[PDB]
Every structure is written in C-alpha cells, then in structure tokens.
Design a protein around this ligand. Structure first.
Ligand SMILES: Nc1ncnc2c1ncn2[C@@H]1O[C@H](COP(=O)(O)OP(=O)(O)OP(=O)(O)O)[C@@H](O)[C@H]1O
Ligand SMILES: C[C@@H](O)[C@H](N)C(=O)O
Ligand SMILES: [Mg+2]
Length: 321
C-alpha cells in the first residue's frame, strides 16, 4: 500500500525525509531519487533489510550493493586505504562517482558486499539523498530502482511500473538529472580500473589516471526492454535493418528524426546529455508502443554517449556492427 511523496530536489521538506528515515529504522525498503537514477535502499548495517532489496529486485545474491554515504567521516567508518585518493574523492564528491575500497568490516554485513572483502561507496550529489542519509544516521545500500534486468528508473512513473504495491514509500523529486548510473572506478589494485562508465567521463579519468584500465566487458556486451533490442553501430545498415525487422519502432536523434516511420526522438547530438537523460525512458516508451522490435541508432563511443552505448550494448538482443 504505497505512498508517493513529492519533494523539492534542492530544499526537500525534512518532515517527508523523517518519515522515510523512520521506515529505514524499522528495517523497511524505500525508493529515493539521486542525481543519476532512483535507488531502492535499506539500512546498510541491517542484514535482514538488505535481503528484502534482493527479493524486491528478483536479484541474484552474488550481485553486491553500493553503500551511499553523506560525509567523509562515514567513509572512515566503512573503508580503509583510501587516504592516498582523498584529494581525488574531495574533487568528485559529492557526485556521480562510486569507488571500490577494501572494506573496514565491522558493521557492513556480508549480504551487502556478496561476501566480498571490497565495498562500493558513493556520496551522491542530490540534496534529498544527502539529507535522507544524514537524518537516518546510517549509510544506505541501494541498487538502481528497477526489477533486476530492466531499464534503471529515471522518474516516478518507471518506479511505479516496477514497484507500486511492493514498497511502503517512494520519494518523488522528478526526472533524475543524468539518467545514467554513477561511474564505477576500482582503486584497490596496482592500477585503477573502470567497471561502469557514467557521468564522470572516461576522458576525464584518463587525464587524472594515465594508467586507467578499461576492461573488454566495458567496451563490449541488464537494462533490457520487454521487446527485443536491435542496436545499429553502423548506420549505413539502417535502411537494411528496418526491412529485416518489419514490426519495428525506432529510437533516433533530433537530427535524423524526419527520416523514419514510428520514431521516438531520445534527444539531439547538439546536446548529448539530453540523450543520456532520456535513453532509459525511451526503452520504456518503446516497449509499450506495440511493435515487435525496438531499433536503436548507435552513438559516438565518446563522452557521455560512451556510457549510453555501454548500457544499450548490454540491453541489445543483437548488435549490428
Ligand atoms: N564491492 C564491489 N566490487 C565490485 N563491483 C561492485 C561492488 N559493489 C557493487 N558493485 C557493482 O556495482 C553495480 C551496482 O549496480 P546495481 O546495484 O544497480 O545492479 P545491476 O548490476 O545494474 O543489476 P540490476 O539489473 O539488478 O539493477 C553492480 O554491477 C555491482 O556488482
Ligand atoms: C541509486 C544510484 O545511486 C545508483 N546506485 C548509482 O550508482 O548511480
Ligand atoms: Mg541496476
């Protein structure tokens, strides 16, 4: 029996956050916005409560949870060996960055980290998330707000498709600013490793970390619509793809919109952050539009479109290179 409470993203009503904090203290799961995607969270120090996240998501046990913190003092309670990277953390936090550290053990139970010695920490640059964590008093473990394998929720309409009647409370702060999950950098090995591309762009990370490792699984083929996804890297095969796949809807850009039948304009190449903001919404609009096949234009493997292509490659049923 779900409550949806609208709050301002800048100065949220602290009475709405106290109610969410109370539900977290009772070991309940709630949904809250961040600058990236909506989160489905619980008390990171509550084993049983975090287990409910796994069940609500329909999620495998061996997939660990990102712990959300509000302060550098909380980092010190949960992680160790970060001291040589504090300059870097202080430069990107709060913000759309998740880092892997060696766990300080103590209170973040094994279920949160899938029995791993590492923990993924994020200090989100969203006043609602920051003020909820500070008021609750404990860090929040939160995957993206979606059924496991589905596109990450970027607004309350999507949360509701996935979770109406399953959680007591959804905080609504509207459309998430970025539409894409946080960059994930692992800092626990000889050289830093990019595990997930996001709003902290690869190009920026390569400027700071010349020796950054970007693994094959990041550049090659979660986030899946209900109808089969055809990704077209080579846009000269677009004329040919549309034919091989008759019952189609297209997702294209503003500049190529007037060149298709049933088409959803995800955004413009003039403003590529608009593409990243709306891509997940586009998969959800498209799967509803009652066509057999969803057909997506590829983008430049550069800037934020790098992260978009990363998401669409893992979504795709076929990639047309
Ligand atoms: N300690 C860790 N070491 C490495 N990767 C981690 C660690 N903790 C979390 N991660 C990764 O961070 C990501 C968090 O994303 P999220 O929880 O939204 O799940 P997901 O993989 O997108 O699956 P779903 O479809 O269920 O949302 C996962 O890929 C998870 O494995
Ligand atoms: C919920 C949101 O913070 C997500 N886990 C991310 O890392 O972007
Ligand atoms: Mg996810």
């Amino acid at each position: 029996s779900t409550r949806v409470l609208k709050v301002d993203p800048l100065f949220p009503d602290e009475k709405v956050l106290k109610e969410a904090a109370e539900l977290l203290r009772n070991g309940e799961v709630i949904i809250f916005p961040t600058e990236t995607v909506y989160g489905i969270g619980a008390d990171a120090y509550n084993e049983e409560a975090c287990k409910k996240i796994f069940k609500l998501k329909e999620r495998p046990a061996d997939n660990p949870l990102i712990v959300h913190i509000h302060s550098f003092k909380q980092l010190e309670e949960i992680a160790e060996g970060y001291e040589p990277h504090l300059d870097f953390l202080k430069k990107f936090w709060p913000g759309p960055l998740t880092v892997i550290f060696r766990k300080k053990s103590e209170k973040i139970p094994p279920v949160v980290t899938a029995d791993l010695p590492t923990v993924a920490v994020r200090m989100p640059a969203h006043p609602v998330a920051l003020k909820l964590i500070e008021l609750f008093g404990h860090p929040i473990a939160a995957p993206s707000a979606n059924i496991s394998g589905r596109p990450s929720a970027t607004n309350v309409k999507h949360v509701i498709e996935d979770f109406m009647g399953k959680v007591k409370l959804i905080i609504d702060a509207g459309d998430t600013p970025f539409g894409l999950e946080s960059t994930i950098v692992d800092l626990t090995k000889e050289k830093p490793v990019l595990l997930r591309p996001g709003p902290v762009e690869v190009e920026r990370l390569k400027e700071l970390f010349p020796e950054l490792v970007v693994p094959d699984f990041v550049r090659k083929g979660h986030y899946a619509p209900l109808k089969p996804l055809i990704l077209v890297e080579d846009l000269t095969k677009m004329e040919e793809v549309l034919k091989k796949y008759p019952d189609h809807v297209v997702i294209c850009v503003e500049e190529r919109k007037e060149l298709y039948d049933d088409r959803i304009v995800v955004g413009s190449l003039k403003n590529p952050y608009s593409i990243a903001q709306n891509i997940f919404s586009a998969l959800r609009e498209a799967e509803k539009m009652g066509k057999e096949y969803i057909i997506v234009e590829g983008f430049e493997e550069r800037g934020i479109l790098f992260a978009v292509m990363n998401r669409l490659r893992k979504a795709a049923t076929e990639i047309v290179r």
